[PDB]
Amino acid sequence: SKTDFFSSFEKSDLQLTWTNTVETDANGKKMSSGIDGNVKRDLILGDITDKVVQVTASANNPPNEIDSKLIDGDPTTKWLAFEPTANIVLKLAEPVAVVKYALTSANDAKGRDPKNWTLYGSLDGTNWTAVDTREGEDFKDRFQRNMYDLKNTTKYLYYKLDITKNAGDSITQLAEISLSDGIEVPAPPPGDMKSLIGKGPTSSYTAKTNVGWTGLGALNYSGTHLSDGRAYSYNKLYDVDILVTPATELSYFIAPEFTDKNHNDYSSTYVSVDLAFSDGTYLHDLKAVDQYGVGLNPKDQGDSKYLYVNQWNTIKSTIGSVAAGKTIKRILVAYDNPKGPGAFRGSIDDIKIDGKPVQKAFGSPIDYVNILRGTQSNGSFSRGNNFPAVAIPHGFNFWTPTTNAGSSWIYQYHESNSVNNLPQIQAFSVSHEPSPWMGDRQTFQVMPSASTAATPNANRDSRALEFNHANEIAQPHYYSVKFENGIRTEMTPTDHAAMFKFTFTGATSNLIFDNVNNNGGLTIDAKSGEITGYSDVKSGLSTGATRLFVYAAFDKPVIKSGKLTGESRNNVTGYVRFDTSKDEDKVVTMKIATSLISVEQAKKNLEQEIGLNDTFEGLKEKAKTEWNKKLGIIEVEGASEDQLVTLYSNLYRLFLYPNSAFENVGTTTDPVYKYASPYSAATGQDTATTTGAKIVDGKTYVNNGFWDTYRTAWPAYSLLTPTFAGELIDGFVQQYRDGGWIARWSSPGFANLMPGTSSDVAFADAYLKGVTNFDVQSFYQSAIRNAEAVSPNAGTGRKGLTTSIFDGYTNTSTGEGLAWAMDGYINDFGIANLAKALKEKGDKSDPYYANYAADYQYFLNRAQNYVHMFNPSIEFFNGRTANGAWRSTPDNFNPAVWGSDYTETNGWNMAFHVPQDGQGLANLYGGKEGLATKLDQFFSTSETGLFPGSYGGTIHEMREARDVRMGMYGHSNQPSHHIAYMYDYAGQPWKTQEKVREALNRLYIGSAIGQGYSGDEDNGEMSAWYILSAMGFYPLKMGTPEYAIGAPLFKKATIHLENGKSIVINAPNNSKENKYVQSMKVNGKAYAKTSILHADIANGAVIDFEMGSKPSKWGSGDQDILQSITPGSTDGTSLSPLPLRDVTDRLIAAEKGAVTVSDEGNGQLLFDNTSNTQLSMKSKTPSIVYQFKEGKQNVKMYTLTSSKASQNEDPKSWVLKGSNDGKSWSVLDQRKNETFQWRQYTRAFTIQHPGKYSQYKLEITENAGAEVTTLAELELLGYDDVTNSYQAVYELMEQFKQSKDLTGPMAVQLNNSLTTSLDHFKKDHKDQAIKHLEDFLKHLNNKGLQDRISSKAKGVLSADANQLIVLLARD
Ligand SMILES: OC[C@@H]1[C@@H](O)[C@H](O)[C@H](O)c2nccn21
Ligand SMILES: OC[C@@H]1[C@@H](O)[C@H](O)[C@H](O)c2nccn21
Ligand SMILES: [Ca+2]
Ligand SMILES: [Ca+2]
Ligand SMILES: [Ca+2]
Ligand SMILES: [Ca+2]
Ligand SMILES: [Ca+2]
Structure with missing residues (x-):
């Protein structure tokens, strides 16, 4: 017998052996319990509608108004056809004699209602007997149900409603059909779980609905889980005879759906494919596992949370591991869920069994990179929201296919598929998009065409060409697509240029030029075979974007040429035509380059980067080489294929941004760098061939929101590419020297979005880690400008500084003022450490020199101003009004509610926004234990996505956060990214280990089908989170040169540093389950601390983690935690000390x-x-x-x-x-x-x-x-006067004497020592005040006196005494 099996549930595929059928056991007892498959509906007498297994209408209006809608029990969903007549065919499970039926009119447009019809009956589906005629029927109201009776005793298997006349419109529609046999059932019995070939997902965030994963068919399942406890149904689909081998893979695609209004019922994820073997065993009993390690059975599929709902999911299992030698007798679909009630619905497509699967081979890191990650993703749910960017690392242009040539939503994996369910390219584009939200700019478009019409039609829809993803190769250095119609397009990048190969099949071949919109130009010089152009295209947030210029050349004569018209794009639409009748002329090559300076410069850019001798293959190799130099900085062992895809694609995303926006205006031998400024006012007006923008000497880089990138990407650069990092930084410092400020969001100029000025911390952080190859002096100036000088520009500096520098907090008069505030304090942390470092440098030629010392003090103080935004009544960070009063009080506050103070999250997620001083943060919560309690609550309260707060309706970030399903933790977005590591401050590092591993495991999945992330990737940030966390350490304390320790993902990782040394990270016992650090060594020597200095790894190091499956106490000691500005000894103080x-x-x-x-x-x-x-x-x-x-x-x-x-x-x-x-x-x-x-x-x-x-x-x-x-x-x-603090301690001591927490000689000795200390303080005897407080502490720890103090009292009084010493030392 056979070893292979495949079904896409198409017309051309085998139909199900059984429909809606439960598998029985060895005893003939149905393997189902507590399930109801019947759709909920308004039932008529003898309603039989549930036996309809298929409905097919003559015409349809996908995606939402299709025949399927006729039997779904919802009057609110309708079928519509753009025709005055049509016929609907209903196929039943078993022959029944229909004696009654009901039609239901739709929502609107009465004229589209059926009016004359015939109902036919059939046995075979081709020969029809009429059973009822109706003529001149009326439906007074919308959603109206008319009832119809007939004589018929003949059992039929098909029913046709033949609609011969509608009510006058040229369109027909109907909301519902129900059939009946006329037999009473006062108590309708539960039906079996549905399992039948249908049209696929009825709803989906990111895919085309009512089509399959591939093709127009899929397997649909649905039902109601009635029970409070377990309910299940194992249903048989296909009778087969398949021998399993040791290598056999089962794979399939599953799209579970939410059936509830609230999108909170995950029941549909409790499903898998199952197999009945000839020996009476089932796959669900064997320990088959998916590519994630999750049991291939329904219960483990649902419990483990790797399936996303309203999305497609790829699943793959080597059943050969456990079932070699068995024969499969039946393929099953199974639902099995321990808890309810609830309801489920979903689709499965492309069930494959492969006896002898061919594994993909990889020669080098780049072979792992899928540039399509983040493209089965959109504004409803993001799985990255990237586009297929082909480019060199940090390149001046991106190049990309687009399936939507009008839009910044550049490429849809599935959503925009044709009527045949294939994706369609509308053009190949030059792109500079930082994200779809920021938008594209400086774009230009080409599209190949085999049109033979006098003139190629430039309409987007009609020129579009379908393709299969299986025919597409999508890599950083090479993109290739073979279209259904035989054309192939391939492209490879240079910094400023690119080469394209268009290979045709016909005698007459064309390239159509176009643009996103009409704001540009095209000049076609047919005689020299050249294209010339410019682009003013720029989105709303592309602030400062200047004109781009295009030059292109061909390797073949152009025989016909010209402008095109009719698309409202007359400035930009044209074509060139070539004679490709002869075989050696079938491929045409276009060389293309871009400039922001001039057309002449585009020409010069091309000559510099694509010499006469360069070939497509040579250029591709050069790009591959440049990528491998970046990707191969990290080399791991023990990684799965899925892990290496994620790792190397992450590294690609990391180095895709930011981007050169400068040009070489000299020669290759003697470079002279200059750029058109998006930062200062244009020198003058643009021409067709030359920019009006100011031409500024030197380098610059662009495309970066610092609110994202400071967290991960920038420290990643400083660690992985120290030298290039400095060149990148200087190119941002250039923005200061030119336009007065460093960009907050460079797109490419000073765009206005997101809180904070985090260039401050990012670049300070880099400097302190030894990236000193930039203009630190100017950087500093730009930082203090951000921190001390009110900005006249919407897009630069710190909003609310007018009042905030004086108040210590940012008030609600600034939108998301809390968010501005908290990020302010972190930036000040970095500005302060840099000031200290520059002080120590002692450069007397720096005019600002005398001022560094003061700035350190002032800024270190400002870093602790978080206290001013901590609302003690609710114990959360919270906004204040202008008058100083808290926004919220215990009566009204809800940490689950998004917005207001909390940018793209809720109060929960900003509860921990003090990475620069965790001890200080712990103290606000009562100490380390209080911090840990807060985190625990954070991670165990589920984000429901039901609390939009000030956003009004659901935003995508909410759906994504909901679907992380790590309590409240919004890993889908940047402001939560520090939270897991905050357990290192609480002395519970095992919880950091647990959370980091879940994040790495579950939230970077789906690469193979264009997914890959849990939300927007954002210019390398989401990627660097993974890269850094997977190495086992993380730059939590941005602004100081050290990392917080998590745990490594791999058995071994090496970071090859540019100085020729290695960071080796050994974890030989690592595994999916062995996630907890047992012990640790650095350089052969046992290591106790959960922090490590950059200076300890930057020159090479050997790091050993002992990994195991159970938490340990490693790194939980009081001096083992991350240190803070606030001393550890103060843990749990009752005092509330303030900075300056x-x-x-x-x-x-x-x-x-x-x-x-x-x-x-x-x-x-x-x-x-x-x-x-x-x-x-x-x-x-x-x-x-x-x-x-x-x-x-x-x-x-x-x-x-x-x-x-x-x-x-x-x-x-x-x-x-x-x-x-x-x-x-x-x-x-x-x-x-x-x-x-x-x-x-x-x-x-x-x-x-x-x-x-x-x-x-x-x-x-x-x-x-x-x-x-x-x-x-x-x-x-x-x-403030320290005296007031002493007072607060007497007060507390009295509270403890009254409760008997503090008595006898302990009370007296404490009283005496505190009083003697106080007396010394008031006589300005600082050293003696401290010495007496040390006596106070000795008393607390006197062994003879422990029966005179409670642990509670000893604890807080210790902390208070130490806090007093700190207050004294600074007085
Ligand atoms: O083009 C038909 C569309 C329908 O699909 C839609 O449901 C609605 O009934 C409507 N009103 C005017 C036009 N349309
Ligand atoms: O793309 C720009 C900004 C990002 O910098 C940021 O991560 C934020 O989450 C966001 N949502 C939509 C757009 N953006
Ligand atoms: Ca299919
Ligand atoms: Ca309906
Ligand atoms: Ca004033
Ligand atoms: Ca003041
Ligand atoms: Ca984001």
């Missing part, structure tokens, strides 16, 4: 402070916490005095914010003085010859001789030249 703040804040209004100016101006404008108010003081030489009415203030720093007015009015030299009486002043700080290069720009100064004073005076000794002196704001940055 402006101690004048809010005093004036509460009358606890006031201000006087030497000229009697309103000095309140200098302390109102807004740079939108300034004071002009009528003197070159004014004085401001701030008076604290409630005692001495410990001020460490102060800030001056330049005004909006001219720079000449600025302070320039000054003295800050302190006093206690107002008569006698001490000199605290002196500055000379200061400047404020920007407007509304804050500068911070470290007071040379600080102390505690009740009165502060700023005495301006010199200004910048004008007759007046103007400022916007002043601040006195200091700390």
